[PDB]
Each structure stands twice: as structure tokens, then as C-alpha cells.
């Protein structure tokens, strides 16, 4: 009803259509990517500096770190939106790695529509310090995008890319795409 065909547009990159959205996966360093939004997978205090969160906060810079701690003390947040700092993006959305991954991705998609953004890049949310299982994380990410498409909510959002630290986790995402393809 929604899924296109899995193919490889460049070496190590795999893509398929989900409704109107191009969904892509690749292994690499997320801090070198360009997108309207980059997603950080962090702790409930928004000040973790381990694994992918270390790279994102170090590259983004101290003003973004400052933004995070200030919003954390203002209220209880399920996620926080900051500037991009020295990353190549318009905003960073910082989600909690231990939270429900489908819910976190659904929130990212809705916030990107609110800003009329077209591109998103995210890590394998929850597979770092939170130690959620890669198979469940892949299923949750793709389920969130399917639901967003099914509800007719995709308007500005055109491209969602997962850039993944470990090649072994990329294999799990590829297998999930092949399970779903038309
Ligand atoms: C050991 C390790 C390293 C690393 N990131 C990285 C650092 C330096 C490079 O040159 C390449 C990748 N990450 N990210 C998440 N967990 C990690 N664990
Ligand atoms: Cl995590
Ligand atoms: Cl990752």
C-alpha cells in the first residue's frame, strides 16, 4: 500500500519510497551530514556526552550545550529543539534514547512539518547508552514514518535518512527494508 523498491543510489547507501517520502540508510559519521534537522539521541537531562551524543555536542558547540541545559531546567521535556550551532542544519532535535522510539520519531516528523522542512537525518535512536535492541529500533523508526504517511501528514517532508555508527546495525535496517518492500 505504501512501500516501493529497495535500491542502492551510491555505494553503501540503500533507499526506498514510503508513500511520497524517500527513506535512506547508510553507515558513517552523522556530524558530517547536511539536512534541515539533525536528531541527537541523549539522556533525560539533555547533557550526555557519550557515543553519538559526544560527537553531536562537541561539533555543535558550547552555545548549543548552553541552550540544552537552560531548557532542561525550565520544564520537564520529552524532547528539546535548539539551533544547529556549527553543524550543517537549521535545528537539532534532541530526543531521549530510552523513550519509546516510534513516539520520538513521530514527534520529530510533526515538528519538521510545523517548520516546512524537507530533510531529516537521524542516528539509530536508542542503540547507544540506552541499549535498546537494533531490530526493535529499526521496526519502530520505519513504523513511525508509515503512520505519518497513512494519516496524510507528509506535505513538506520529502527525505528521511538514518546514518548509523556500526555497519552491523546497518545490516539490521537493510533487512527490515527488504521485509517491507513492494
Ligand atoms: C569507540 C566509539 C567511537 C565512536 N565514534 C567515532 C570516534 C572516532 C572516529 O574516528 C570514528 C567514530 N562512537 N560513536 C558511538 N559510540 C562510539 N564508540
Ligand atoms: Cl541512545
Ligand atoms: Cl547510530
mmCIF file of C-alpha atoms and ligand atoms in Angstrom:
data_model
loop_
_atom_site.group_PDB
_atom_site.id
_atom_site.type_symbol
_atom_site.label_atom_id
_atom_site.label_comp_id
_atom_site.label_asym_id
_atom_site.label_seq_id
_atom_site.Cartn_x
_atom_site.Cartn_y
_atom_site.Cartn_z
ATOM 1 C CA UNK A 1 0.000 0.000 0.000
ATOM 2 C CA UNK A 2 2.897 2.354 0.824
ATOM 3 C CA UNK A 3 6.308 0.683 0.077
ATOM 4 C CA UNK A 4 8.429 0.998 -3.060
ATOM 5 C CA UNK A 5 11.543 -0.963 -4.073
ATOM 6 C CA UNK A 6 14.914 -1.142 -2.262
ATOM 7 C CA UNK A 7 17.898 0.012 -4.389
ATOM 8 C CA UNK A 8 21.386 1.495 -3.916
ATOM 9 C CA UNK A 9 21.901 5.018 -5.415
ATOM 10 C CA UNK A 10 25.522 5.201 -4.131
ATOM 11 C CA UNK A 11 27.936 2.645 -2.586
ATOM 12 C CA UNK A 12 26.762 1.615 0.909
ATOM 13 C CA UNK A 13 23.554 3.732 0.679
ATOM 14 C CA UNK A 14 20.141 2.000 0.419
ATOM 15 C CA UNK A 15 16.803 3.654 -0.268
ATOM 16 C CA UNK A 16 13.101 3.019 -0.807
ATOM 17 C CA UNK A 17 9.921 5.094 -1.120
ATOM 18 C CA UNK A 18 7.408 5.144 1.759
ATOM 19 C CA UNK A 19 4.460 6.980 0.168
ATOM 20 C CA UNK A 20 5.945 10.223 -1.128
ATOM 21 C CA UNK A 21 8.999 10.135 1.266
ATOM 22 C CA UNK A 22 12.444 8.831 0.233
ATOM 23 C CA UNK A 23 13.765 6.711 3.172
ATOM 24 C CA UNK A 24 17.552 6.122 3.129
ATOM 25 C CA UNK A 25 20.093 4.316 5.318
ATOM 26 C CA UNK A 26 23.929 4.370 5.391
ATOM 27 C CA UNK A 27 26.825 3.844 7.832
ATOM 28 C CA UNK A 28 29.045 6.829 8.774
ATOM 29 C CA UNK A 29 29.569 9.969 10.854
ATOM 30 C CA UNK A 30 26.255 11.841 11.316
ATOM 31 C CA UNK A 31 28.136 15.087 12.201
ATOM 32 C CA UNK A 32 29.284 15.455 8.546
ATOM 33 C CA UNK A 33 25.692 15.370 7.187
ATOM 34 C CA UNK A 34 23.648 18.304 5.863
ATOM 35 C CA UNK A 35 19.853 18.366 6.482
ATOM 36 C CA UNK A 36 17.175 20.780 7.715
ATOM 37 C CA UNK A 37 17.098 18.817 11.029
ATOM 38 C CA UNK A 38 19.711 16.526 12.642
ATOM 39 C CA UNK A 39 18.462 14.354 15.556
ATOM 40 C CA UNK A 40 20.532 13.734 18.744
ATOM 41 C CA UNK A 41 19.799 10.646 20.952
ATOM 42 C CA UNK A 42 20.597 11.729 24.536
ATOM 43 C CA UNK A 43 19.672 11.372 28.243
ATOM 44 C CA UNK A 44 16.618 12.859 30.025
ATOM 45 C CA UNK A 45 18.851 15.697 31.282
ATOM 46 C CA UNK A 46 19.915 16.585 27.664
ATOM 47 C CA UNK A 47 23.618 16.761 28.687
ATOM 48 C CA UNK A 48 25.001 13.293 27.803
ATOM 49 C CA UNK A 49 28.373 13.287 26.030
ATOM 50 C CA UNK A 50 28.905 9.608 25.155
ATOM 51 C CA UNK A 51 28.792 7.900 21.780
ATOM 52 C CA UNK A 52 26.813 9.758 19.099
ATOM 53 C CA UNK A 53 25.780 12.444 21.671
ATOM 54 C CA UNK A 54 29.506 13.192 22.335
ATOM 55 C CA UNK A 55 30.102 13.846 18.622
ATOM 56 C CA UNK A 56 26.962 15.959 18.189
ATOM 57 C CA UNK A 57 27.587 18.220 21.240
ATOM 58 C CA UNK A 58 31.335 18.623 20.514
ATOM 59 C CA UNK A 59 30.710 19.610 16.856
ATOM 60 C CA UNK A 60 27.585 21.766 17.598
ATOM 61 C CA UNK A 61 29.457 23.788 20.253
ATOM 62 C CA UNK A 62 29.023 25.317 23.683
ATOM 63 C CA UNK A 63 26.129 27.668 22.787
ATOM 64 C CA UNK A 64 24.016 24.593 21.849
ATOM 65 C CA UNK A 65 25.115 22.890 25.118
ATOM 66 C CA UNK A 66 24.004 26.075 26.921
ATOM 67 C CA UNK A 67 20.619 26.036 25.113
ATOM 68 C CA UNK A 68 20.045 22.402 26.206
ATOM 69 C CA UNK A 69 20.683 22.864 29.961
ATOM 70 C CA UNK A 70 18.618 26.063 30.089
ATOM 71 C CA UNK A 71 15.528 24.381 28.539
ATOM 72 C CA UNK A 72 16.037 21.281 30.768
ATOM 73 C CA UNK A 73 15.718 23.409 33.954
ATOM 74 C CA UNK A 74 12.706 25.424 32.620
ATOM 75 C CA UNK A 75 10.288 22.457 32.380
ATOM 76 C CA UNK A 76 10.001 18.664 32.001
ATOM 77 C CA UNK A 77 10.575 17.910 28.278
ATOM 78 C CA UNK A 78 10.126 14.698 26.242
ATOM 79 C CA UNK A 79 12.471 16.327 23.640
ATOM 80 C CA UNK A 80 14.112 19.755 23.045
ATOM 81 C CA UNK A 81 14.630 21.864 19.875
ATOM 82 C CA UNK A 82 17.832 24.003 19.635
ATOM 83 C CA UNK A 83 19.790 25.808 16.951
ATOM 84 C CA UNK A 84 22.259 23.885 14.805
ATOM 85 C CA UNK A 85 25.403 25.593 16.130
ATOM 86 C CA UNK A 86 28.324 24.533 13.937
ATOM 87 C CA UNK A 87 26.511 21.502 12.465
ATOM 88 C CA UNK A 88 25.162 21.741 8.897
ATOM 89 C CA UNK A 89 21.490 22.038 9.806
ATOM 90 C CA UNK A 90 18.805 24.605 10.706
ATOM 91 C CA UNK A 91 17.834 22.911 14.042
ATOM 92 C CA UNK A 92 18.876 19.957 16.223
ATOM 93 C CA UNK A 93 16.046 17.962 17.838
ATOM 94 C CA UNK A 94 17.369 16.199 20.973
ATOM 95 C CA UNK A 95 15.276 13.085 21.820
ATOM 96 C CA UNK A 96 15.685 10.772 24.863
ATOM 97 C CA UNK A 97 17.335 7.481 23.789
ATOM 98 C CA UNK A 98 15.455 5.436 26.455
ATOM 99 C CA UNK A 99 11.994 6.675 25.380
ATOM 100 C CA UNK A 100 9.617 4.894 23.012
ATOM 101 C CA UNK A 101 11.351 5.228 19.603
ATOM 102 C CA UNK A 102 8.148 5.303 17.489
ATOM 103 C CA UNK A 103 6.824 8.195 19.622
ATOM 104 C CA UNK A 104 10.151 10.116 19.369
ATOM 105 C CA UNK A 105 10.267 9.778 15.554
ATOM 106 C CA UNK A 106 6.570 10.804 15.260
ATOM 107 C CA UNK A 107 7.391 13.990 17.256
ATOM 108 C CA UNK A 108 10.401 14.775 15.011
ATOM 109 C CA UNK A 109 8.241 14.415 11.848
ATOM 110 C CA UNK A 110 5.477 16.683 13.259
ATOM 111 C CA UNK A 111 7.976 19.414 14.327
ATOM 112 C CA UNK A 112 9.595 19.330 10.855
ATOM 113 C CA UNK A 113 6.165 19.837 9.190
ATOM 114 C CA UNK A 114 5.488 22.796 11.540
ATOM 115 C CA UNK A 115 8.685 24.483 10.179
ATOM 116 C CA UNK A 116 8.007 23.495 6.489
ATOM 117 C CA UNK A 117 11.283 21.486 6.432
ATOM 118 C CA UNK A 118 12.085 18.912 3.738
ATOM 119 C CA UNK A 119 15.028 16.793 5.039
ATOM 120 C CA UNK A 120 15.838 14.948 8.290
ATOM 121 C CA UNK A 121 18.911 12.922 9.336
ATOM 122 C CA UNK A 122 18.838 10.721 12.496
ATOM 123 C CA UNK A 123 21.012 8.069 14.203
ATOM 124 C CA UNK A 124 19.778 4.578 15.222
ATOM 125 C CA UNK A 125 17.984 6.191 18.204
ATOM 126 C CA UNK A 126 18.298 4.205 21.470
ATOM 127 C CA UNK A 127 21.096 1.806 20.413
ATOM 128 C CA UNK A 128 23.808 3.790 22.318
ATOM 129 C CA UNK A 129 23.808 4.279 26.123
ATOM 130 C CA UNK A 130 20.067 3.338 26.293
ATOM 131 C CA UNK A 131 20.906 -0.188 24.931
ATOM 132 C CA UNK A 132 17.611 -0.766 23.060
ATOM 133 C CA UNK A 133 17.819 -3.697 20.611
ATOM 134 C CA UNK A 134 18.663 -2.757 16.969
ATOM 135 C CA UNK A 135 15.875 -4.923 15.450
ATOM 136 C CA UNK A 136 13.160 -3.227 17.566
ATOM 137 C CA UNK A 137 14.661 0.251 16.861
ATOM 138 C CA UNK A 138 14.570 -0.284 13.039
ATOM 139 C CA UNK A 139 10.946 -1.569 13.219
ATOM 140 C CA UNK A 140 9.912 1.476 15.318
ATOM 141 C CA UNK A 141 11.581 4.103 13.073
ATOM 142 C CA UNK A 142 10.002 2.705 9.885
ATOM 143 C CA UNK A 143 6.576 2.203 11.632
ATOM 144 C CA UNK A 144 6.566 5.917 12.617
ATOM 145 C CA UNK A 145 7.147 7.016 9.007
ATOM 146 C CA UNK A 146 4.418 4.626 7.709
ATOM 147 C CA UNK A 147 1.854 6.019 10.216
ATOM 148 C CA UNK A 148 2.766 9.638 9.273
ATOM 149 C CA UNK A 149 2.218 8.822 5.558
ATOM 150 C CA UNK A 150 -1.015 6.831 6.217
ATOM 151 C CA UNK A 151 -2.549 9.817 8.101
ATOM 152 C CA UNK A 152 -1.865 12.176 5.142
ATOM 153 C CA UNK A 153 0.593 14.226 7.230
ATOM 154 C CA UNK A 154 3.552 14.256 4.781
ATOM 155 C CA UNK A 155 3.486 17.628 2.954
ATOM 156 C CA UNK A 156 6.856 19.457 3.320
ATOM 157 C CA UNK A 157 8.904 16.377 4.484
ATOM 158 C CA UNK A 158 10.494 14.618 1.439
ATOM 159 C CA UNK A 159 13.644 12.794 2.722
ATOM 160 C CA UNK A 160 14.427 10.870 5.937
ATOM 161 C CA UNK A 161 17.976 9.413 6.250
ATOM 162 C CA UNK A 162 19.349 7.199 9.077
ATOM 163 C CA UNK A 163 23.176 7.495 9.370
ATOM 164 C CA UNK A 164 24.377 4.619 11.559
ATOM 165 C CA UNK A 165 27.658 4.266 13.565
ATOM 166 C CA UNK A 166 28.059 0.456 13.329
ATOM 167 C CA UNK A 167 27.952 -1.445 9.986
ATOM 168 C CA UNK A 168 26.367 -4.420 11.812
ATOM 169 C CA UNK A 169 23.387 -2.183 12.750
ATOM 170 C CA UNK A 170 23.085 -1.005 9.121
ATOM 171 C CA UNK A 171 22.581 -4.693 8.152
ATOM 172 C CA UNK A 172 19.550 -4.903 10.506
ATOM 173 C CA UNK A 173 17.963 -1.781 8.887
ATOM 174 C CA UNK A 174 18.550 -3.164 5.347
ATOM 175 C CA UNK A 175 16.857 -6.475 6.275
ATOM 176 C CA UNK A 176 13.828 -4.597 7.640
ATOM 177 C CA UNK A 177 13.533 -2.580 4.381
ATOM 178 C CA UNK A 178 13.642 -5.822 2.311
ATOM 179 C CA UNK A 179 10.915 -7.364 4.531
ATOM 180 C CA UNK A 180 8.607 -4.414 3.723
ATOM 181 C CA UNK A 181 9.347 -3.731 0.039
ATOM 182 C CA UNK A 182 6.609 -3.923 -2.601
HETATM 183 C C1 LIG B 1 34.603 3.744 20.247
HETATM 184 C C2 LIG B 1 33.475 4.573 19.708
HETATM 185 C C3 LIG B 1 33.708 5.543 18.725
HETATM 186 C C4 LIG B 1 32.652 6.307 18.232
HETATM 187 N N1 LIG B 1 32.785 7.297 17.249
HETATM 188 C C5 LIG B 1 33.923 7.551 16.462
HETATM 189 C C6 LIG B 1 35.028 8.196 17.009
HETATM 190 C C7 LIG B 1 36.154 8.444 16.242
HETATM 191 C C8 LIG B 1 36.193 8.045 14.912
HETATM 192 O O1 LIG B 1 37.302 8.289 14.154
HETATM 193 C C9 LIG B 1 35.094 7.400 14.358
HETATM 194 C C10 LIG B 1 33.971 7.154 15.131
HETATM 195 N N2 LIG B 1 31.426 6.025 18.776
HETATM 196 N N3 LIG B 1 30.226 6.606 18.483
HETATM 197 C C11 LIG B 1 29.373 5.966 19.274
HETATM 198 N N4 LIG B 1 29.942 5.031 20.060
HETATM 199 C C12 LIG B 1 31.240 5.065 19.740
HETATM 200 N N5 LIG B 1 32.252 4.329 20.221
HETATM 201 CL CL1 LIG B 2 20.894 6.042 22.809
HETATM 202 CL CL1 LIG B 3 23.868 5.073 15.430
#
